C-alpha cells in the first residue's frame, strides 16, 4: 500500500481573501491577546468544541479542560455542556479560552509548517433575513504550535487541527463575517 499523495495548503476562499485576513489575525491574537478575538468574530450563536485525539502524558490542555469542567459543575451544575459536548456563546467560550494553555504558533509565512485548506460553500442561513441563503467559508487548519506546560514553565510541542466555519455576521457586527463554528482537536503533546 502507498499512502495518498500529500500536497500543500489548498486555499480557495474567494475574492476577498477572508481566510488569509482572518487566520492572520486569529493566530496572532490567539498567542498574545486571545480574548479580544471574541468581540471581533464571535457572537451569542457561535459554537466551540475542544476534543482530544490522543492521551499524551501530562497533557497541559487536558488538565486545564478537566479543571474547567469541574468548576463548571460547581458553579452551573445543570449546564447542558454535559450531554451536548460543546460550548455556545461568547461568554462561556471566553471562560474556557482563558484556562487553555498559552501558545506560540509559527508564522503563517512558513508555508511548510501549515496545512490550510478552505473553500466557500452554499446554503447557510442569512442572519439579515434579506436573502434566502448565505455563503459560508470552511477553513481547516492542521499544524503545530508551542504549548506551555505550567507545571514546568516550559513550552512543549502540540499537533492540532482546527476547523472554522465562517459566515456573514449579524447587523452591527465589527466585521462582515463571523465564526459560526470553531472545532479544536488536540493531538500529541510532547515536552521539548
Amino acid at each position: 500500500p502507498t499512502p495518498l499523495p500529500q500536497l500543500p495548503s489548498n486555499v480557495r476562499d474567494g475574492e476577498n481573501n477572508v481566510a488569509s485576513t482572518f487566520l492572520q489575525a486569529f493566530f496572532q491574537l490567539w498567542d498574545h491577546d486571545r480574548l479580544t478575538l471574541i468581540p471581533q468574530f464571535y457572537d451569542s450563536e457561535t459554537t466551540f468544541s475542544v476534543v482530544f485525539a490522543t492521551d499524551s502524558p501530562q497533557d497541559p490542555a487536558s488538565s486545564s479542560c478537566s479543571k474547567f469542567s469541574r468548576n463548571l459543575n460547581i458553579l452551573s451544575p445543570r449546564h447542558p455542556s454535559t450531554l451536548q459536548r460543546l460550548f455556545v456563546g461568547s461568554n462561556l467560550i471566553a471562560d474556557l479560552w482563558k484556562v487553555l494553555p498559552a501558545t506560540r504558533h509559527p508564522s503563517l509565512d512558513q508555508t511548510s509548517q501549515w496545512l490550510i485548506d478552505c473553500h466557500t460553500f452554499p446554503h447557510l442561513a442569512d442572519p439579515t433575513g434579506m436573502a434566502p441563503y448565505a455563503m459560508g467559508l470552511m477553513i481547516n487548519v492542521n499544524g503545530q504550535c508551542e504549548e506551555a506546560d505550567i507545571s514546568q514553565n516550559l513550552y512543549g510541542t502540540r499537533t492540532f487541527s482546527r476547523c472554522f466555519i465562517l459566515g456573514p455576521s449579524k447587523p452591527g457586527a465589527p466585521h462582515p463575517y463571523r465564526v459560526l463554528s470553531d472545532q479544536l482537536t488536540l493531538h500529541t503533546w510532547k515536552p521539548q
Binding site: 476562499d13 474567494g14 475574492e15 476577498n16 477572508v18 466557500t120 452554499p122 442569512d126 442572519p127 439579515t128 434579506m130 436573502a131 434566502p132 441563503y133 448565505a134 455563503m135 467559508l137 465562517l166 459566515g167 456573514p168 455576521s169 462582515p176 463575517y177
Partner: peptide, 6 residues
Amino acid sequence: QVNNPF
C-alpha cells in the same frame, strides 16, 4: 442574491 461576504 446570496449573502456572500467572501
